């Protein structure tokens, strides 16, 4: 064939973290929320099978699986950690997923709450016709 193709999609990873007015009965001092979305409320669900948040093993049911948007997790905690996030694609051929190590950090009391955003671009070179159609429907 004479044609080649490169499709590029943008994802926004991010988290919010606030010091609680009163710690939970467990001692947890913060409420946080972490998420994967697309920009402009894009419909990434067209090409995203599921999003998996790998919480620290200290949390109950550490493998949090989101098969349908919003792709997010809301918890309380007391300490920052690295949170591996895996985005699975509605694809049959490589790549079938992409992994990002998300820095879930928390700020001390007396400092402002955390609102963090991290932009990531994914580039698919010569996707199949059906993966390509889903990618571009987003």
């Amino acid at each position: 064939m004479a044609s080649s193709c490169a499709v590029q999609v943008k994802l926004e990873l991010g988290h919010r973290a606030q010091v609680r007015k009163k710690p939970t009965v467990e001692g947890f001092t913060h409420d946080w929320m972490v998420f994967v979305r697309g920009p402009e409320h894009s419909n990434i669900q067209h090409f995203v099978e599921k999003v998996v948040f790998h919480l620290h093993e200290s949390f109950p049911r550490p493998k949090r699986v989101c098969k349908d948007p919003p792709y997010k997790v809301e918890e309380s905690g007391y300490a920052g950690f690295i949170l591996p996030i895996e985005v699975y694609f509605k694809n049959k051929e490589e790549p079938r997923k992409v992994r990002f190590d998300y820095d879930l950090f928390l700020h001390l009391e007396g400092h402002p709450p955390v609102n963090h955003l991290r932009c990531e671009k994914l580039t698919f070179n010569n996707p199949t016709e059906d993966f390509r159609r889903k990618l571009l429907k987003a």
Binding site: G80, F105, H107, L108, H111
Partner: peptide
């Protein structure tokens, strides 16, 4: 630091 302690 502005951050809390961390876990691994």
């Amino acid at each position: 630091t502005k951050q809390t302690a961390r876990k691994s």
